[PDB]
Design a protein around this ligand. Sequence first.
Ligand SMILES: CC(C)(C)CC(=O)N1C[C@H](O)C[C@H]1C(=O)NCc1ccc(-c2cncs2)cc1
Lengths: 86, 103, 141
Amino acid sequence: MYVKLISSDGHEFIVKREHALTSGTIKAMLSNEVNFREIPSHVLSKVCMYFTYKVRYTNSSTEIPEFPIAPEIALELLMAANFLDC
Amino acid sequence: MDVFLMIRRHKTTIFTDAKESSTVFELKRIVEGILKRPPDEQRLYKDDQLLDDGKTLGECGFTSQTARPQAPATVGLAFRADDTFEALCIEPFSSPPELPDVM
Amino acid sequence: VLRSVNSREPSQVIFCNRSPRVVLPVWLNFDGEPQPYPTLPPGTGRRIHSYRGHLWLFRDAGTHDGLLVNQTELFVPSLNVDGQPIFANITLPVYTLKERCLQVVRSLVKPENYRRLDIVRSLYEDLEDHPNVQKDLERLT
Ligand SMILES: CC(C)(C)CC(=O)N1C[C@H](O)C[C@H]1C(=O)NCc1ccc(-c2cncs2)cc1
């Protein structure tokens, strides 16, 4: 079961609904596509990668690796993560 | 062992996972469920290489330690419009700006 | 409220840093004051003498970012069974994306320059609100 997150520049990211419901903001925007007019694709792809990461490593005994973030995208990602509350 | 993927065509990106032991064809079924196109109208690629239906994602080089949740591997996707397959095309993501003077 | 119990009952512990951070172990002394101890580099461990009922938490030595120990905030050395130390397993938490972003931004920008970043005021405040041990001791209390 999937939802579509669309970046400001038209890229369409298709992720599992439960991965997206991580974000309270997206939960609200759904209650099933969501258009993000401020989030470019090089940020939204990272947001989707985090969903996968959180779902995989939340409550896990297997050692947890650092979630990587390039300096180039950190500001923009911070803005997005703040807005999405994730 | 799970592998984590971005299946990409044009401006479409699918985030999903699969078993290392699962087949290219089985990945196409997943795409079929999501994009409503049968396997015969699909080609999957690793970089420039055309993938064979019967081969496992493991043989094709998608392993659990390279295809990671936080940094998943890309699988190219191309559709057959009617008679012939289109060429593999993946629109790049937008570019981040210059690092501010303070960073 | 959060202090070590002066039990005087030895308990040996293995501090095991299974994180990519340089780890600062903090012993909460008998008046609740955090006492820093020597650091552990990533992937290293140390056999240490502590005591039953003593309270320890663990941070990133550089940024004071919070870490987990055996899946929780606080580690309390328990009774040693059959001459075996207690394993204290220090790992990264699953930080929220927001806090992770803030760590990386803090690591690139000197505190003097947060105000020059082109972001809403409230993120400027979130950056300046560094992870702090006293804060979390009040939070845990
Ligand atoms: C009141 C005192 C500090 C003397 C009671 C005491 O002996 N403590 C408090 C804690 O339970 C730990 C213990 C202690 O200080 N043991 C010596 C010790 C020395 C180095 C280290 C470390 C070495 N590297 C990282 S931590 C840990 C314990």
